[model samples]
Structures are given as structure tokens and as C-alpha cells.
Target: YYYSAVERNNLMRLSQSIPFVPVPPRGEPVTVYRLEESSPSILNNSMSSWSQLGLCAKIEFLSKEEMGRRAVKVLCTWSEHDILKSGHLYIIKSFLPEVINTWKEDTVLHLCLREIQQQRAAQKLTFAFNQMKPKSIPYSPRFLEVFLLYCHSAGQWFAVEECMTGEFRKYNNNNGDEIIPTNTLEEIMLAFSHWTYEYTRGELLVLDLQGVGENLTDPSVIKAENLGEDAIKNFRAKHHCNSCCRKLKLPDLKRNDYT
Candidate 1:
């Protein structure tokens, strides 16, 4: 499920608070060698001179719906005057499952999907409806962003890393501070289960309506409809914020407060 802006902001802040090492220092800057194109040029290069230095490539998959169409923008940077050119600049599409896989190799794609589904299911009904609405349904495409990095060693690209919005850092590691050690699939499941339990418990307390109404026609029920509208508006606002947070690589959502 998508997160609200407040929730996303909180998560990002939390994720950042988790201890993480900065990207390592760069040894040397690479120069542009040549440019290649996977397909015909789609954009004007004169507007961006850097476009002249690289090649465009595309990757096709069997399940178009699952993976979506992917294109990689590669900027070939090699040593100038020196025949031995070293590395290249790469910007690739980002997907949650793809990002997680880079950190945990054994993680199954289905697990990520399940986690997202579970999170969605746990959302407040009004919030869920807003997210499921036609306009919100296509939000996954919004999650796609560019991951930028340079591959120094020939044939040896570093581990896929989360792209930072501003300047590219030297060191590649982007695991933020808190290191919750759930290395295996079983452990991961346990962590999610615990999260679900806590989330549901909190929801029950906040949404308890047993004493408020007896049937759909009750006055309390009518009042709830008005309240639901506000809930939905808040939910949409939060969802948009969450998307922004993810793109910015900010902390995860906080549970108690709405930022």
C-alpha cells in the first residue's frame, strides 16, 4: 500500500536515523568515451551536452505487466587521451522488489508483493478506497525513478544502490542506520508479522465503533460518512507525500504522528 506524506516523511526520517555508512570517496573521475543508442534518439541532446557522452539501452521481459518496459541510460566515461578507459555512468529504473533484491539476494519477489498487499489491507477503509480509486491505481508507475552510479572496475559494477537526489556520493552503501538483523526469509516474515500485529492493534483502538451504532441507518453511521470524507482527503494527501519521500530516499513512516 502507498504511504501518506506524513507517514512517508516519518519513515524516511526513521530510515535515515538508522546507522548507515556514506558512499566511499572517489579515486578518480572518468571521462566520456563514446555514445550509443538502444533505439532512435527520443530527446534533443543539444539541450543537455552530457547526453552526447552515453548510450541508451532497453531490457525486455516476458511479463510486461509485472516488470513494465525498462530502458537504461548509460553514459560511457573513459580516460581521455589514455586508451585504457575505466568506467561508465548508469541510470536505471527503480522498483521496490528490485531495490530490495540488491540488498538481500534470497528475498522472493512474491514476498515484497505480499508485504505491499498486507500494508494496503491494513489501511483505514476510507484511505484504502482513495488509494484504489482509478487515478490512484496507476501509482506504481510513479514509484519508478532513476538510480545513478558509476561503475569503475571493468565488468564489475558495484551492488545496485539507491540513488541519491543531489550529487552522487563516492561510497555506494545506502543501508541507513538501524540495522534490524532479519537476514533469512523466515526472519523477514517474522518481522512483517510483528509489524502487522502492532498495526492492527493500533487500528482497532482508533476505529472501534461497537458502542456507536447498531445498523447502517443509525445516526452515528450517517455521521461516519461525513467523517469518512475527511479521512479520504487526508489519505490522498499522505499517499502523494509518501511517493515524494520514496523518490527522495527519505526515512520510513512514523507510527504515532502525521508529518
Candidate 2:
């Protein structure tokens, strides 16, 4: 759905007026589906520690404010959750009501889960790449693993994941300029985009690589059902592979191979 300028403004105004509903009590039961394990395979790593599992939990939201765009986000806590059985802060995200109207809730949630699975697959790919990386490489690329939170009691569905705290940054955009990484970690991330393209046999390209440091979220994978089909070409034309790319023995993406 392409929103015109006027439509965007109208949605923005409507978004501001939309209020969050009450949070369910702390002990309410919920179903959590971790996308990494459940989604169809793109790639997999047996050595990676993250489990292939889902669970039922007692979950609750701790915040009362909306903290995102397109989707409303709030601080959430889940007991008997991954990493630990104790309470820990995470984010619970859902599409905005107006967005739900544009793309029905099912489509929205389905795509959201698909995106999560994509990132999880990327994470495994990166992990495998890291195993053979040169010793000189200072950082390893990572993607946040995400889950779908189904709260039947509240009649709400949310995508939940770890809460990243730091100075957030945007490294690149789909069909736009790639931000030349300022530091070692940033350079690795930039080169990872090029690697992802070739590694996937030019079938997929990851863009919108942004977040705090090497851990990224909300990435755009340029593949089927994804926007920016020309993104791989754009990336090849513009990307200047850093030392990490050279050390990783990745083929020069700058070369015009697509022709």
C-alpha cells in the first residue's frame, strides 16, 4: 500500500490520537512462537546456542506508551521465557490500527513473522560466516531473534524480542545510499550486505542494516515478496568492500557480474 503525502499525514494524525488499550494482568497465559526454529529453512547452524523451541508463558506489558512507527510498541515482560525464567524487559510490537485496516491483521502478522524468520536465517548465516572469519576481523555481525506473542486473553498479537538500548543508527536504506561505516564494527556490517548478496547466490540481499552496533533489527530482505528488486544491482554498484570483506575472501561485489 503506497500512502500518498496527504494519506501519510492523515495516518500520522490518526496515529497520534490512537490510545493504547489496557495491559492484561501479569499472570495471563500467552503462546510464544520463536520464528527461527519454526520457519522453513534458508540456512541453519547446529553450533549456535539459541534453541529451536516455543513455549507458553505468563506475560504482561509494563509500559503504557506507544514507542514506535507503523506498529505500536511497549515494554513487556515474560516469565519462564528464553534466556531465563525470571522477569526481563523486552519489546512487544503490533501493527497500528490504521495499518491493520490497510493490510488486514492476518497479512500484517504473517509478513511480520516472515520478516522475523528472514532475520533469524540471516543470523544463522552470519554465525556460520563468523566461524571461519579471519582472526583480524574485530566484530561479528548479528541479528536479533524474534517471536510472535499471542495473548488470547487480551485478543492481541505481538512480535516480541530483546530490547536494544544505545544510540540507534541507520546504516543503509533499500534503493538508497549506503552509509559508509565510520568504525570497524560499522565497516563489517556494510560488507556483510555485500556478502549476503553473493552468499545467497544473488537470490537475496539484506538492506536497511541499522541498529545499535553489530546487532540489527528491522532489516529489509530484497527477495520474493520484498521491495527493491534492483537493490542487489545498486549494492554492487555502490558498495566499497572493506578489509573485512577482503579478509573474509568474499568476491568483489563491485564487479558487474549481473550483466
Check candidate 2 and list the clashing pairs. none
- How close to the true structure is residue 187 of candidate 1, measured as C-alpha lDDT? 24
Candidate 1 at residue 37, lDDT?
A: 22
Residues 1-259 of candidate 2 have per-residue lDDT tens digits of 8999999998898867677799656555776766434333434534323334657676555556776633433433454545323455677677666665776456656755766766776776676667667878888877777777777777766777777888789888787468877788888888877777777787877788888987888777777332655676677778778877787788887676667
TM-score of each: 0.16, 0.73
Candidate maximizing TM-score: 2
Query: Once superposed on the true structure, which residue ranges of model 1 sit more than 4 Å away at CA?
Result: 1-142, 145-153, 159-259
lDDT of each: 0.28, 0.69
Q: How many residue pairs clash in each candidate?
A: 19, 0
Candidate number with greatest lDDT? 2
Clashes of 1: 19
